[model samples]
Every structure is written in C-alpha cells, then in structure tokens.
Target: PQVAEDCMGLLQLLSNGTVLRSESIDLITQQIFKNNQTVLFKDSIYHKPNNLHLRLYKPISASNRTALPVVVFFHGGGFCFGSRSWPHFHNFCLTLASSLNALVVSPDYRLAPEHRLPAAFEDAEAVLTWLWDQAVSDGVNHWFEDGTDVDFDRVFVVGDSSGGNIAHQLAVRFGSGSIELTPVRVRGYVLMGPFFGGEERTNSENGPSEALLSLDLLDKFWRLSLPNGATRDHHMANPFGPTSPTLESISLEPMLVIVGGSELLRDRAKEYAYKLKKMGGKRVDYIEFENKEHGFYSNYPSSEAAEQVLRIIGDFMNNLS
Candidate 1:
C-alpha cells in the first residue's frame, strides 16, 4: 500500500515494532489563544505510577460564589495520538471553560500498541478517582483556592473521537455502579464523533474518505489499539455489537452526541444515539454538521461550526437536570 507522505509523517508504523510520530501534525490544527482573561490553566499529575498528567482549566470570573460545573474532557487521537497540551485542544477548552463557566479537566492517558485498550480506560477511571479525592480532601492541593468550588454533582464526561469512546466507557461503568465515586456524580456526557466500528460496514463508512481519518488509517488504529487478536466487533470498539452489553440494561445519564454529516463515522454515531433513545427513558440529543469532517471543531476553532458546537454544549449543560 502506498501511503501519503503527510499521513506517514503523522503516524508511521515501522517493521521494528516502533511507531514514529511527527510534531508537525499538531502545527496544522494549532490555534492561537486570543483571550486570556476568560480562562486560566494549570497542570498536575493524576497518576504517579505512569506519570500520566492532566491540565485543569478554570474560569477567571465567577459571578456566583456557588460551586461551578466540571467538565472532564478526553482528547481525540484514535487512542494513540494527541495530548492534553495540544494547542488546538487547549484553545477549545479555553472557550469551553469561559463560555460554560465551568472547570475543565483534560488528562493524558497511556497510548496504544504500548499500553493498549483497557490501559486507557483504567487511566480515565483513575482521573475521576483523583478528582474525587480533590473534592473530599482539605486544602492540601489548593486546586480550588480562588474561592471557586467544583460542583461534584454536576460533573460532565466529554470527549471527541477516540476520547469519545473513553467517555462512553467511563459513563457506562459509572452507570453500572461498578466504579464508585460517592459525592461526585456524573451529570451528563458529550460525545463528539465517537470512534465506533464493527465487522460490517455502514453507508458512511463506504462513503468518501476523510483526509485525517482514511479507512486504511482507521483500520491501522484499531489494529494497534485493540488487544491482540481482537476484531472490530469487540465490545470496546462496538458498544452495540452482539458481544456487547445491552444499552437498555444500564442506567445512563443524559447524553449529547455530535457528529459531522460527511464524516466516515457518521452512521455509527447516529445509530448509537438512536439506540440510546430507543432504550425508552434516556435523554439523548443528536446534532450533525452538514459538509463538515471529523475533528472539525478542534481543527478549526474559529469557524462557525465550532462556535455552534460550543453554544449547543452550553445549552445542553444548562438544560440538564
């Protein structure tokens, strides 16, 4: 297979069991942070064993002395790429923090082919545990020293692409009561172009290919990320697959699923929303951006589509009971 030079530069899987990645990929989607007055950010390590770090974005101005909503964000990169400090993600979180008047926690999880599937999910769970400790502890860390408190009851799990997959997994675990974080409740979820697949192809998957997420690249990502010998039908990759748990069995919180109309993953995302709604009592909201491609909002933070997404998310957060 002849791979594009740009694609190879982004991610090259060599025969020597090494993955070569270029920093130039970050440059393409980087956005300048224009407004510093709205949000302030700080970094901290959530997992000491793996040295997994996380960035906390706080709103500068607090109109009310009451506790603020929390957004736990996972960045997109097919579970193998991307960082919490990427300029595009940082800028987007800055806007999210300011517009929503919420505290955003974005974490770096263990990557794939080195750490693999359940490792990333475990890291995500650890982040929530760390947050729970912060909520219950004294002023040891001073994470909320600005007289601004985090509303543990209004925490939202949010992510895009592969990160979206992580968010959903976390939500399902919490919903099933398998993971316990008392006093810290998950109010809702926001999945943007969540990465889901199966053995059978959908209409969108057979449609035009995207520049950053071609079919070949998508397959490569699954090959490297999933456990050895696990096919696309694995429960982690296909939540609605036969091997996966029934959606109606779990008690899920309100969810907002956003997808691009022209993206390859559109069909699965739509199906996910549909299935969740058909579960009979779930509050699932779906939005699709016509002509937009995957990762559109983060790649083009200044575009109208990006602005619309932020607005819709703000409304979703506000409307959630």
Candidate 2:
C-alpha cells in the first residue's frame, strides 16, 4: 500500500488521517504588532470538562460605555486545526474588538479525526450557552470588570471558511428553536469564505484551485472532519443539499456571505445566499473579492482587501436594525 501525501499551504495531509501544519508567516508579523493598547483581552475556561477555553477581547474605550455589542468569532482550519490562541486569530479579534467597539469572544473546539463531526458544533453551542450564563448572571465574571454591560441583543457570529460552517450551524439551531438564548439575540452572521460542498461540482470547483485551499486538500479535510462513512453531501457539509434542511424552513437572521472570486467554494456560498434570499426571503448580503484566495483577510491582515472586509463588517453591524 502506498502512503498518500496531500499538501496545501502550510498543511500536509497523510493517508492515515494525520495532519501536519507548519507555522504561518502571519505569526511572525503578529509578533511585531503584539502590543495592542486599544483592546484588552483575557482567556477564560468556558467548558470545564473539556477544559475548552475562549479568549475575550474588549476595547478600552468600551469601559466608559453603558453597554457593548458582542461578536463571537470561530476560527477556521477546516474543522481540523486551529485554536483561539493562534496569532492570526488573536490579531484579527483585536482589530474586531476595537474597530466595531464590540466585545469579541473566540473559542477553542476539539479538532477532527480525533473528535470529528458534531464535536465542533457542540463546542460552539457550549460557548453560546456560556455567553447566555454571563448575560443572566450578576455580570461579575472575574473576566469582565464590575458594572460592565453586554448588549446581548446586538450579538453577531462571524467566522471564516470552516468556522463559517459552524456559524451557519448555530444560526440554523437558533432558527429551529433548538437552542434559545432569548436575551442574547444574535443580530446577524458574517460568514467569510464559508466551507460548503456537494457531490456535483460547480464551475469554480472545476477550475484551478488556489494555493491555500486546493481541491484535494478540501476533499481530505471533509473526509477527516465529517462523520464516519459520510459523504460531502452530508447536511453539515452541504447545507443546500437534498438531505439538508431547507433555507426556507429555518427563519434566519440577517446574514453576510463573503467569498473570494478565486475560491473553489465561492459558488456554493453564492448559492447559499441566493437560496436564502429567493427561497427563504431571508436578508443575505453577498460580497466577492476579485482574485483573492481563501482566508485572505486573516492570512493577510495588512492587505487592502482585509481592511475593506473590516470596514464592511463594521458597516454591516452598524446598519442592522
């Protein structure tokens, strides 16, 4: 038997379902901008059993405010590799906290092949429950200063790539009324380069794959992350697939679906937004960055597209009713 070795930028997938990821160049750049005075951050254990932690980022200016909006960010690594402590995630959250003047919470979840499928989803849900507890508590969680007020009504879920899938899943759960955070109203979702797939390939999927996220890498990721014996058409991977819940069936909040023109998954995300608008009459905004690759904003924070993305997000949150 031959050993199958698949490589993507920084990620190497083995036939035995092992993944090796090298350090990203962004980490080096992150060190240079390590001192962030505008946003103060801390780590807290959200789930005691798993020792799952979440990082909280609060803008310094928000201290004087009566209430602060919230952004719950889920990092993307194809549901396989990524943590709340990654420098890219940390820097991105810092910018998000200060730019939107919102409290940002980024949580860690169990990776794939080891935990697989619903594990990540369950972790995300747990993080939400933790937020709910904070909302109902006396607001003295040692993590936040006394008298700090969080405007749960303005909470938003934002994620990139696979994290976007988790964000969508949470929205689905919320819409289905399976999980209720009553006062912690999730105002909207910002899904950047969401990971959605199908058995039938789209035009972009058939085209040349990007360096960061190639077609083979994506297939391997799905194979390792999804449940055993599950295909790409699984409802979790393909939200628009026949077996999946229809967009019309779930009453969703305003959603912003962003993609890169060069991304293989661009069409699926576009279709998601299209179906939500046409079939569900849901409010969905779609944006595509020409020539950009997957995870561009987080990978290239200094790029023009990254800055534009931040501005668009700020505007999206600001304009929400």
Candidate 3:
C-alpha cells in the first residue's frame, strides 16, 4: 500500500542521498486526521525566505481559566527531511496534544544536503525565540485566540529521532547558559528514540538491528548534514564526545529518555542514561519497551506500543505537574 510503503521509500532516498530535488519527492501534509474534536490546528511562519514555520495544536479541553503547559516539538528526519505538514508528524503532534491536553507546537526547519547543519539548529532556536517574544507581549497570539492560556513556566521540549537530537542540543545551550530567556523555563525534555552517532559502534548498531538506521546511513546522514570537517563524534551527535560540553558544565532540567528493546540505538540509550546521571541530572527517568523497533510509536500509532508509550508519557507529565 502506497499509504506506508511510498513513505518509507521517500525516507530511504533522503538518507541515501539519492533524492535531492524537492519536485521528485511527494509531499503530504493534509489528511483526515489533521484535525478533530480533541485538537484544533493552525500554522504560522516564524521566518521567511528560509521557509521556517510552526504548526500549532491546542487541545479542545484547554480552558482559559488556567494556563496549560506548552510543548515545543521538533520532528525527526535525520535533519535531512521532515516537515510540519508531513502527515506522520502532524498526526503524532495531534495525538500528543489531545492525550496530554497541552498546547503543542511543532517547528519545521530547512532540510540538509542543501542547507547543511546549523541551519536547522538556528531555525529551531528561532521558533522558541519567537515564542518568547510573543509570550511577553499582550498575549494576543493565535495560541490565545481560542482563549487558551499558555504556561511558559512549564514549557517542555519534546522530539523523536533527529528532532530528539535537536531537543538535547537546544537544552544544552540553555543549560550551559549559552542562551538565556527568562521565565520561559524548559521544565523537562522528552526524547523518544533519539538519534545519535559516535566513532565507536555498539552491539546494537552492529548486528541485525532495526531498519531505521545503519553505519552507512549514519555516515551519509552526517556527511550531508554536518558542517564541513565535522565528524560523527562531534558534540552535535555524541554527548560524551571529547568536544562536547562537560555534563557538569550544563544545568539541564529533568529528562525523560525513552528507548526500545528492538531498536538499533538501545545500547546507546543506556549509555545516555548513565551519562545523564554522571552529568548530575536533577532527575532522569529511562523507560525501555521490549521488542519494539526504532520509532515504534510513530510507525505503529494504532498499536499497543503507541498507547503504552503515551500512557507512560502522560504519567511523566503528571509527575511534572
């Protein structure tokens, strides 16, 4: 069925360096699941010319009587290919908004092999910066158009795969005091199936791993995305890399790292958990779902795995509340 197979092929071409022309790719952003009684949606441009934008989703249950936690999301595509309009991310964001009953914002950045690294990173930060600017104003923004109150005090950054990498990198920026935005606190970071690469390969990446990534694909992902002269072990990809900021040098809020048993990055996720502890992470919760693949939630949104992950995430969110 083209429903899923074609989407897989497009992603393969993106990481394989075969498809560069946007005209050659099929873009799908609109679908039946884009909106529903549980969630309302809208899109806005954060930056022009570069085509940076954000898709905002607000739960219908959100009320003006109380401010709701905000979720600033980044979608995963290895920083090579992804869009706010992509049905996969749109649906996921919608599901998150309705399930969490929070205001969800997903930002779209420039793709790589064309714009390269740092471009996406810059765009990601720009969206948050824009949000801060709007937040301090008269509160007349679209988020408030529906009478929903956004609680900047409880802002959270959430992502999957490459988006997860961006989430961590961004948190590191604020954590190290590299970028400061008062009152817009990042209370927690939720990383689901984060994407990271290193000079050393773990057992998970070596054997019959999940089909999401490989040594060759990882090489291509970085080759087409990283700045010239940067390696896979660069701090951007590896948190413990030589050049990465010392864990103690960063002051991150709590973190919830989700991993899967059948995923290719399972071992790496474990390392991440231990490193978070060594970094003096205020609070760290690591959950692993047995026999699930990389991005199993997004791949099988209707499956038990998806429901289970969301339940765990809801619990995590409640704890933060």
Candidate 4:
C-alpha cells in the first residue's frame, strides 16, 4: 500500500527503481489526451513517422486584423516522464495563455528512455517546421485555420522545469542566433523554476517547510534524458552545472529568465542573467520568488505561488511588447 503525503507529485519523483507499477507515462497520457481531445498538431515528429502531437489552450483574444503572438511551450519531466496532460500542465497552459494573452502550443513530443535523445529534439524541431512551412504547401498558415492568428515575429518560448530547459534550447537554437539554415528571432522567453544543469553541488532551500524533491532524482532524470554515450556538456542531454553558457544564443535576443530563490538552480539562473548581460549587452529580466521549489507552482489551483508566477509572466509578456 502507498502512503499518502501532502502531495504525491514530489514523492513519486523519489520512487525507487524497484517499484511495481506501470512505468510508462504514455499510458496515462493516452487516456488524458483522449478525454481532453487535444488538438493534434499539424506537425508531428520529424524523426518518427508515427507519434502524437498537440496544441493546448486557445488564444486569449485575437482578430485577423491583429495577429497576436504565440508561445510554444514544452512540458517538463526531465525528458523521460511527462506528457502534455501532466496535471500541472493542464492548468498552466490555460493560465499562461489567458494571463500572457498568447496562443500556447504544448507539444506531445516523444520522451526519452523510449524515443531517446534527439527524438524529443526532432519532435520539437518539427513543431517549428510546421509553423514556418506551409502544411498544404500552398502558403496557408495552419495556425490561422484554427481560429488563431499569430505574429510569427513576436513569438515567445515558455516552459517550466525540464520543459524550461528545452525552451532554453529552442530559444537559442531555433529562436535566434542559432546556426540553423534560417535563424529566427523570438521577441522574448519566460522560464519558471527551471534547472538548466542536470547535476549540481548544492543549493540553499527557500521553499515550503517540508522537502519533496532532491538531487538524487535529478541525477536519474539526467541519466534518463541523455542518449547512450553522451556527456553533460552536450547541452540538451545534461544541463551541465547551472553555469553552463549554452544559452548565450537566446540571451543575445533579449530574454527573460525566472526561477525560485530557494531552488537548487537559483544561483545558476542568477549567474545566467549576469553572464548573459555581460556577453549579450542586455540585462536578463530575472524574477526570483521566495519559499518556492523547483516545481513550486504546482502547489494548488489558488496557491499563492501559482498566482505570483502568473503575475510575473504577465508582466514579462506585456513588457516584451
């Protein structure tokens, strides 16, 4: 029998490898996606021919005459254990869309340990291609058909936790200044309680009284997300410590970085802000909250932490415009 705690989300993260349970998060996602009837994205996986795709939460307000900006969000669960329907994400996408006034597309990309590395990356990349390329090959934006008109130039990449790290990569590698064939520039980025590095020494806890997550779980997540024979410095695989400079690309385009003050990666995010400013000639819009953890915003629907995070994101979006 499983013992109950204040919240199971954290304890579940600490589950020993020997636990007897259906480990595939996909099983849960299938039911959730079916129930919610998530919009199957026009662009699926770039590598795998068969896979799920999704875009959650509609636009807050929009008109053809006024093309609103869109935010492409990636779900967090280290790279292995999450789906678009992760309880935390359901409300987040809605709240973020409504709060930030941007259309949000939360991709149901393949996770690691099954699809492995590069698979998630390819799925993410496909999302970009579908947006930039005409699906029917006739120059019609699919987003337009879905009652959404986005200003492609004023796009933003936003996510939390592991998703936040993916957003960072997307921002730098695809957002702007990337070495890709076409270097697109995003107007802004918002990261909530993100851990850029996979491994770290230690961090001062400043969150709720009881601890839920720890470095041990994070290390496992790193091992799971990385492809066979990869290193921490690989950027997408393991975040390397918090001070990794792989994000210098997106920082060059005026970025917004947020984190919990007590989070293990708090200093890393702070250092990121400073280093980006030093390297890119602009100050990173950094917001640090008190008494929050890595996944602090998942507390409750009306949790103070959640409300505060929404406000911070709203302010950042408005300012970006």
Q: Which stretches of candidate 2 lie over 4 Å from their true place?
A: 1-37, 145-147
lDDT of 2: 0.81
Range of the 10 consecutive residues with the lowest summed lDDT in candidate 1: 22-31
* TM-score to native of every candidate shown: 0.87, 0.87, 0.86, 0.72
Q: TM-score: which is higher, 3 or 4?
A: 3
The CA lDDT of each predicted structure is: 0.81, 0.81, 0.76, 0.58
Q: On residues 1-321, what C-alpha lDDT tens digit does candidate 4 reach at each position?
A: 254443344533432112112211111111111422122223222334644555434433433337656677877777766656555675666666655556666776666665666676667767767655532343434343445555666667786777777666676665354544232336667776665653334344232233655666666766766777765546674344444445445445556777776777677677667766766556478888776666777555456777777777667767777
Please estimate how well model 3 matches the true structure, expressed as its whole-model Cα lDDT. 0.76
Worst 10 residues of 4 by lDDT: 23-32
List the candidate numbers ranked by lDDT, top first: 2, 1, 3, 4
Model 3 worst lDDT run, 10 consecutive residues = 18-27
What's model 3's lDDT at 264?
A: 77
Q: Report the C-alpha lDDT of model 1 over 109-175, residue by residue, as the tens digit.
A: 8878677898888999999999999888843237634445678888998888999999899979987
Task: Measure candidate 3: CA RMSD.
Answer: 6.9
lDDT tens per residue, model 3, 280-313:
6458888899988788888877577887777787
Model 1, total clashes:
0
